[PDB]
Subunit: 402 residues, 3 copies
């Protein structure tokens, strides 16, 4: 329940997700930029050229100056396309935008998985703190009791020293778990991206289930169509195919019309006089009859780049298969390992029942009971470690499946 | 033996390796592109310009219309190079291609190293599974025996509980080793890059020698001459020197030759008529007498980049030296460590022989013999871990030596 | 004291630091390139064009050939700016240079941190070697003593075997510590960057204070004003905020002045004749009245990029906060953990003193005294790991604080 709230807070507030969404907007931006090329590029051109062979003659000087002033609209190099290398670049940018969309979706999924994993780590750390704190209390009781035994003379100073060492070891273990818990809290507050994230998280552990325990892997073909990074690789491959199309179109002759319409006169005063509405059409065909590789090696470059995109697609698919298979193996083995560790914890708890029965029966002293307590609580905390690690493995499996 | 088969399968099928050779074909294509600039670049130009000062007059209107149609060949701004800045870019691309060749060779070497290391890890994991399976069988034997002793009343429930806990601990250990083995298989499958990779590997481990156990490091100068990434950095430094040459050439005047040949007429009907075989010839000397840093800042940028390439080359040399030194230290220490661990395993085996002699002699019960079994089994698997890690260290040493 | 010498050697000699400094020189050069655009770009242009409708007529042929030769200076497209898009690019280059300065400062401080951490690791490894060497000596002494006891028939071969195994385990531990020490030495010599770096480091550990033990974190705002990476992110944000200004200026009309001055003649002989001193001076107003998204998408791309820079700045702030919080938590918990471990080491020391008193008193065996020595040396060496890790945590806290 709180996982959903934390994930919502992250998606609303995490900075890396905002960066990814802005990458989305920028991909749309250059897609629009490239798409603008297909449409006419007409601009208002107001140019005045003063050219003359002798010197001086400024501001209507005494010479044969020709001062042309061309003011009007100009079609700035339209490229009508037989194959649409402009169009090829256009849907190449479109494929880049789609790949960016898939990549941002993958980043969102990864951020959610990190949030859940850090949450689970924090919960496990809280449980381990309860366990280690009460184990240190058990060691303190044992140390005090051995201290009384030595004071009464029934114990050597060596036993007091070893009890002191055991208490120190318990303190060091508690310090290590405290450090782990603080690191987990800081990681969570970073992932949530809000300075009040320490207020949105519960202060105590709970035994409530948080993530679904059984997840069906399905087939590899389904994973191909659902995992975002594979989709991103597919879209990049499509973009590289678009680049191959552009390179192929570059072979063929390119025809461009340069147009203009406006006024022109030999003097500035006649700029807005009748009879100067000039125009210029200039269709031009360029075709390199011998490229020398200038156009060909571009084609081979695009070809090999598309092949590299194919290889990248295959490699990403294989990596995703590797990752999901690892997650499945980890989840299965960890389910069995947690079953074994739960059986072990139950065994130590049975030892608790027996040792307590003996102690209350006056057969075993308090030292044996406390030793049993420490044993069972060590077993319980090494159970919590495995449970947390299994939950993290489940989250990784969910992330891998998309 | 099967290691070479796995390496062949990887080099034939690995997707990242195919990506590397595709990067080499791309780099070669890029060099071809840059080399095409040195050779003449002519193109067939067919242009028709129609211009007139008043408006309308479309399709031979009544005015002083000026229509020009030029159809023919044209040399598009040849740069006659006194310093060969085009040539400088040429062998800069060539050095980039050679550096990419060295980098791809290094990637192939790394792929081989990972394949070998993963395969060794799989072998060690198989041995560890044998070890842990028999350790768990020992634990269950002792558990059943203690269960019988409790049933007969000769043992407390505490002993039965601790035997249960030990069996659970062994089961958890077996689950951990199973997880490790599955992950190793998955990594090997990914490295081989084929869905049938599980058929190219043996289901059982072998004690045969696998990789050469002693490798001579030689001298540092040799490591400079053989290691592929060092060669890549050297070729990149040579490329940066060629860039410095190009920037120096940019200071000097450039001779730009532009020419054309074809037909020109005032009307469309007269394009293919006699007496229109026009031609152009326009050499140009572009030399910026005051660059303002436009050409000088390019220069110290190139010199700074060449110095940075020098620093990178030295840093890569030092990194390779660190890697080979680390690999040598690891190999030596691990040889001695495996000697110690083999001595320890032999010691546990001798203790096994003595405990078995006692048990068959009727002096020690079965529990002591089973305890000796578990002890020797743990020692033997700790030996296998060191042996596997030493093999991995040898492979890392080979990889770092090129 | 030797830390200052080592870090000075690093800054003088480390190849990655020299790489960063050459990166600053490159960034300064790239800014000089961009700043050169604001200033006039004049060009000594010497061009000769020969064009005529019929064929042949080369070298003063018999036709209407026109041979125009222009030799002289030329102002190559001065862009007088109403908003300063060139000025905006200059500001962007300056911001990039400042960001690179902060990044290089960050690389320097990180290099210092790694040098100090490696040096601390080397010192701790030396202490651990002393400890493990004497632990192994104790194991060999116990092994010899048990061997002599067995030879006299007072011990079973089982005790000899277990003593042998213990000695082997101690040897394996010694090999592991030797490997760690060698790796630390190699890392240190790589960080220092000189072949004679191992000459510059002492071969013995020392107990003096090494870095300041208490460091005050201060406020978050102060860290915002001191950490180099956050300053680099701020400068990159400023660069993008100049890019958005450049894109905004791209909307507005831009004026270019193309000028020239020199000689013109219809024949080569008359190039240096009187009255040929010609010139041209040509306003051009370029303004796209209908961009079609060509400029508008550039504008929103700049907006999106600046927003992404804002997100980057915030994310880096949060990352720095996470790092300093982790460092503080680690330092505090590690201070308490080292206190506990020192108490434990003192406890084992007192236990060894008691065991020695008993042994010299003839009550305890030499085996008991040797075991007490081994226990105290194990506690003392596990103290050194905590102390070294605490020192490394302090260095990390210093690094994260800038």
């Amino acid at each position: 329940a709180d996982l959903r709230r934390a994930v919502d807070t992250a998606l609303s507030n995490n900075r890396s997700l905002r960066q990814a969404l802005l990458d989305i907007e920028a991909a749309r931006a250059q897609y629009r930029i490239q798409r603008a090329d297909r449409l006419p590029s007409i601009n208002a051109n107001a140019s005045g050229n003063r050219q003359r062979l002798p010197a001086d003659l400024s501001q209507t000087g005494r010479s044969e100056v020709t001062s042309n002033y061309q003011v009007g609209l100009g079609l700035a190099e339209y490229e009508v396309d037989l194959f649409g290398r402009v169009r090829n670049l256009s849907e190449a940018a479109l494929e880049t935008y789609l790949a960016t969309e898939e990549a941002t979706r993958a980043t969102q999924i990864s951020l959610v998985a990190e949030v859940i994993q850090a949450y689970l780590t924090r919960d496990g750390a809280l449980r381990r703190m309860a366990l280690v704190e009460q184990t240190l209390d058990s060691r303190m009781a044992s140390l005090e009791l051995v201290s009384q035994r030595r004071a009464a003379g029934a114990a050597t100073a060596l036993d007091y020293q070893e009890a002191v060492g055991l208490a120190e070891q318990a303190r060091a273990e508690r310090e290590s778990t405290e450090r782990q818990l603080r690191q987990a809290d800081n990681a969570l507050v970073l992932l949530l991206g809000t300075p009040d994230a320490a207020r949105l998280l519960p202060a105590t552990p709970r035994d409530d289930l948080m993530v679904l325990q059984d997840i069906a892997p399905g087939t590899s073909s389904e994973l191909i169509e659902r995992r975002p990074d594979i989709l991103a690789s597919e879209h990049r491959l499509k973009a590289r195919n678009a680049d191959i199309g552009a390179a192929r179109a570059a072979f063929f002759p390119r025809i461009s019309l340069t147009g203009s319409v406006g006024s022109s006169s030999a003097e500035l005063s006649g700029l807005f006089d009748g009879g100067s509405r000039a125009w210029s059409f200039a269709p031009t065909l360029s075709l390199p009859i011998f490229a020398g590789g200038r156009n060909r090696a571009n084609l081979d470059l695009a070809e090999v780049r598309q092949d590299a995109a194919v290889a990248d697609y295959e490699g990403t698919i294989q990596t995703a298969f590797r990752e999901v298979a690892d997650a499945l193996a980890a989840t299965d083995t960890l389910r069995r390992e947690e079953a074994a560790r739960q059986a072990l914890a139950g065994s130590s708890e049975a030892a608790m029942a027996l040792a307590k029965a003996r102690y209350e029966g006056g057969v075993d002293d308090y030292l044996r009971y406390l030793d049993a307590q420490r044993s069972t609580f060590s077993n319980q905390t090494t159970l919590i470690q495995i449970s947390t690690e299994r939950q993290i493995a489940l989250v990784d499996l969910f992330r891998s499946l998309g």
